Structure 1
């Protein structure tokens, strides 16, 4: 009704995956835009390739971008979103064969807010997205 679940996903070709941000998160993201700006960009029915609005809980559903590798594609999310989805997200990681600590391989704002800032972290943690087929 009011949009309190609202999140925005964006493709990050250089990380071979997707970032997600949320309405409550003030911070810059690796897409070069805040949630606020992103929302402004798509906000008059102006669909833009590589960006989609989603409900924050769609992220932890079985069908989540399933045929393109599901939650394994997530390479960046705000720490606030990790915390919020944590228990579901972990249980989902496990179901997907990604292990319980997959969430810790995912970059966040404490790591960086640009691709150049987060990519070495993704690399050093061995994030599965980096070796999956092209996004």
Structure 2
């Protein structure tokens, strides 16, 4: 798998990481530890994130609270368009934390709270 999603229940959202990102993630694990493990975790294609159908019952992209920065750049223009389609705004992608904000829940929560990230007040995940 190219990418792995993990639920972050404290953020009411998900994180995603990729095979090329060697860094720690807010799940407490690297892509590699996540890959070894695979229930709240799922292997996916990178392009699945910007598909119409992406975790729709959970609110789709509005649930995403962290991705590596290189995943943001890869998806950038599609992701901005989808944000606009879903009513989230062109700048939703900057509401999503990444490794420049931090790699742990402790470090990203305040950012997410400060940016008003919609996951924080959506139905529980």
Q: Please state how far the C-alpha of 1:67 moved relative to its aligned partner.
A: 1.3
Between the aligned partners of 1:64 and 1:27, the Cα distance in structure 2 is 25
After TM superposition, give the deviation of residue 64 of structure 1 in Å. 0.3
Which of structures 1 and 2 has the bigger CA Rg? 1
Could you list the runs of 5+ residues in structure 2 that have no partner in the other structure? none
Shift of 1:50: 0.9
* CA–CA distance in structure 2, aligned partners of residues 24 and 79 of structure 1: 11
What secondary structure sits across from 2:21 in the alignment? coil
Deviations 1:63-94 (A, max 9, x none): 10011111000000000000000000000000
Instruction: Report the Cα distance in structure 2 between the residues aligned to 1:66 and 1:37, rounded to whole angstroms.
Output: 27
Measured on the aligned residues, the alpha-carbon RMSD in Å equals: 0.8
TM-score between both structures, scaled by the size of structure 2? 0.98
Q: Classify the secondary structure of the residue corresponding to 1:14.
A: coil
State how many pairs are aligned.
125
TM (norm. structure 1) is: 0.91
Task: Report 1:118-129 matches (<5 A).
Answer: 118-129=108-119
Q: Which runs of 5+ in 1 are unaligned?
A: 43-48
Runs of 4+ in 1 over 4 A off after TM superposition: none
Distance (whole Å) between structure 1 residues aligned to residue 40 and residue 117 of structure 2: 21
